[PDB]
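As the work plan foresaw, the team has encoded backbone shapes as discrete tokens. One protein thus recorded appears below exactly as we store it.

:::
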Amino acid sequence: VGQAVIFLGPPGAGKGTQASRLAQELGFKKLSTGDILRDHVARGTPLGERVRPIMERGDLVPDDLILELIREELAERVIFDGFPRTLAQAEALDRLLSETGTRLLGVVLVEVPEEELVRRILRRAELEGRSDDNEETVRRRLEVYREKTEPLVGYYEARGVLKRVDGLGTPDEVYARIRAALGI
């Protein structure tokens, strides 16, 4: 048996930091498909040498390899943050969880009013000296995020596993809501 949690949320909602905190506190392994592969290629592993050519040609790593890496990495307790990105990946992941006896505790969707997300992003940008974030670009990136994520929200809501959480408040307040939503 195992348990999994998936985190979804727009830039500026701080969902990654909450995933990292839930990971550290309850013993979940936070997976990063990108990190695992980079590590494999770095160390020149047999798997790394096989994927190197795909990466150099500018191709994307096939979903079957990403799901294979996740299977090689599943543990009793796992957190996904930044995956799935597509409906095909969501479907494949559900099959993998089912096959490995891993129960999906919930898909956390951190929700924040758009005006606050924009204020937050523009503030951090001003402070860090970034020049790529202006109101227009930020609102557009948020609209793209909404368009790409909506199919996943529908997929999980239909299965009764979506946990919408209020992301306004201190990190501690949002964290408490996530634990309550998950029941852990």
